[PDB]
C-alpha cells in the first residue's frame, strides 16, 4: 500500500501526430556547449550550430514537451524537427522573422 500511488496502464504515447517533420544534421562549431529546448524556433538557435537553416524554418524539435537536446563543442548529430502550428507566426528568439512563416 503506497499513499497516492499511480497505477499507469502500460503502453506508449505518440507525440505531435499528424504534423510535418524533417531530419537535419547539426554540428556544433562553437567552443562552448549549446542546449536547445523543445519549442524554440530551431532556425534561430545559437549561430555556432551549423546546419541548413532554410529547411528548419518554422520548425522545432520533435521531442516531448519540456525536454532538451544537448550539443557539446564539436558535436555532430542528426535531429528530428516538427512544424509549428497555431498561427505559425514567430515572434522573439533572435528576431529574424517576427511575423507569419
Amino acid at each position: 500500500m503506497i499513499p497516492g500511488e499511480y497505477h499507469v496502464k502500460p503502453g506508449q504515447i505518440a507525440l505531435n501526430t499528424g504534423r510535418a517533420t524533417c531530419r537535419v544534421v547539426v554540428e556544433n562549431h562553437g567552443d562552448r556547449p549549446i542546449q536547445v529546448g523543445s519549442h524554440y524556433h530551431f532556425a534561430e538557435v545559437n549561430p555556432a550550430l551549423k546546419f541548413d537553416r532554410q529547411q528548419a524554418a518554422g520548425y522545432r524539435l520533435n521531442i516531448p514537451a519540456g525536454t532538451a537536446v544537448r550539443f557539446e563543442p564539436g558535436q555532430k548529430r542528426e535531429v528530428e524537427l516538427v512544424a509549428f502550428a497555431g498561427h505559425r507566426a514567430v515572434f522573439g528568439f533572435r528576431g529574424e522573422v517576427m511575423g507569419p512563416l
Partner: protein, 566 residues
Amino acid sequence: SNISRQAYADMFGPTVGDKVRLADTELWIEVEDDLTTYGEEVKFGGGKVIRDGMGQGQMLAADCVDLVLTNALIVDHWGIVKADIGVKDGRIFAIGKAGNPDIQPNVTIPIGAATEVIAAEGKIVTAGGIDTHIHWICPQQAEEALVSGVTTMVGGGTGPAAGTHATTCTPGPWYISRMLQAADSLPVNIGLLGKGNVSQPDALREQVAAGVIGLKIHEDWGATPAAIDCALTVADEMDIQVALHSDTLNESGFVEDTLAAIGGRTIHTFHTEGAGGGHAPDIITACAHPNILPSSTNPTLPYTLNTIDEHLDMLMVCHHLDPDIAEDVAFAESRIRRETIAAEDVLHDLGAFSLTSSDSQAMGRVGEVILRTWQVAHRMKVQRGALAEETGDNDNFRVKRYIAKYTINPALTHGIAHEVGSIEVGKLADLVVWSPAFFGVKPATVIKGGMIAIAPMGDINASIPTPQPVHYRPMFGALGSARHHCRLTFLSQAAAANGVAERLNLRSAIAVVKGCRTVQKADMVHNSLQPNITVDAQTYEVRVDGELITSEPADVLPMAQRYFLF
C-alpha cells in the same frame, strides 16, 4: 516522437485510463479525459515550454490569463479530468489547453507576459470546501479551516460566549454589524446567521436587514412550532436560508409536529442523525422529504470504535448541561444512539444525506470536514463495495458523490453557488492543490480569489523553500488589502440594498445570496435520494423500505496516524 506512459506520467502527471490512489485510502480515481494535445503540454522551468515566443505569447494583459495551473488533474462533481486551468480577475476563466496560439494547436487559455504559473502536474486540484455549520467561538477557526482546504465558512456567533458555544447565532444588528466588520480580517469567505428563535417577524427582519444570510433555529433558544413558522415566513420573504436544530426534548411536540410547522417549506436540517441535536430519537426521518436539505456534523463520521465513549461529555459541555442534574443527563444520553450513528454512514453513501459540515467547537472539528468525508467514503467502499452508479474499475462516481457534499451542495443550499462551490467558469478562484499522497489531509496550495493565501513553507532563510521545518504560514493572499480583494462577505439582498457595506465601511468584495427558497432535495448534486426510512421508538433501529440499515465500527482509519504529529 514516442514516449512510454510511465515516463509520461512522471513529467506531466497521469493521463486517460491511469489510476491514482487517494492518500492512503482504498479509493482509486481514474482519469476520464485529458484536454491536452500530446507533445504540446505547457511546462515551466529552465529550457521548458513557457518562454517568450514559445509557450508564451505576445498578447496584452486583457488577452491572456493572470494565472495558469499547468497539467492539473481536476476532481469535481462533474468529472475527474486532466487539463490546464486558466484564472483571470480572481475568477475561473477557462478549463482546457493553455499555451501560445502563435505556434501551438487548440490553445484556449492564452499565456503571456502577464501570466503567472503554478505547476500542478502530478497534483489533484479541487474547489475550496464550504462549511455551513460554523460557531464563531474564536477567530483562530478560520486559519485551521483554511489550512484543511475549506475556503468558505458560514455560521454565526460573537465569540466565546454561552450563546455561541451552543448555537450558531449572531444575536442582533449590533453584533451582526460588528462581526461583519471583523470578517474583513479573516482569510475566508463569510456569511452570518442570526438568531431565528422569535415569534415576532420584525425582530427577524431587522437581523436580515442588518446583514445575515440566514437564520438559525436552535432548541437552546426554544425550537417551538410558533418560532419555526415565524422564521420560515421571513425566510420566504427575504430569500435567506433557515438552518434548524430541532426540539430534542419533544417538549412542544414530536418530529412530525416540527415537520408540520415547517409546512413543506425549504429548510436545512443540522446533524440530521441527531447525536448533535434534533427530536429524539427519529429526527433522521427528515431526509425523506423533498424540502429538506440534510447535513451531518463531523464527530460521528465515520462510525469508529471510540465514537460512543467520547460523546457523552462532549454533549454536556457544549449545551451547558449539569451532569449532577438528572434530567440534564437523561437528555444527554437519549441523544447518543449507536443505531443511528451506524445508519448515518450508509445514508451518506446512498445519497440520502447531502451535506457534511463541522459544527466547529460545539460537537464538531473545524479542520476535519474534508478528512472525515473521505474516511466515510473509504469505510463504505470497504463495507459495501461499488455503488450501483459506478462504471469501470474505479471509484469515480463515489468520489463525485462525496466531494459534492462539502463543495457544491453546501453552496446551493445557502444560495451562494453562483459565486463559489465548484470549478466552473465565472466562479471565484477558490482552489486547493494536493499531492495525491496527502489528498484530503494536508494541501500543497490553498488559493483564495486567484491569490495563494496559505501554503506549507519551509525555512524562511533557506536557499530554497523546501528545507525544514515546513509548516503552514500565511501568504500574500491573506495580507491586508490583498485579502479584502480576494475574499467575499455574503450579504442578504435587503442588506446589500440598504447600503450596509457602505455604512459599516466593509472593505472586502461583496456577494449577495439568492435562491434559498427554491432549492429542494432533488437539486443536491449526486445526493438527491428520498428513502422510505423508519426508526423504531425503542430499539432505535433505522430501516429503509424495511431492510435494516447499519454498519460496523472501524478500529483503524486512513488519513490518521500516518500524517499527524499528535
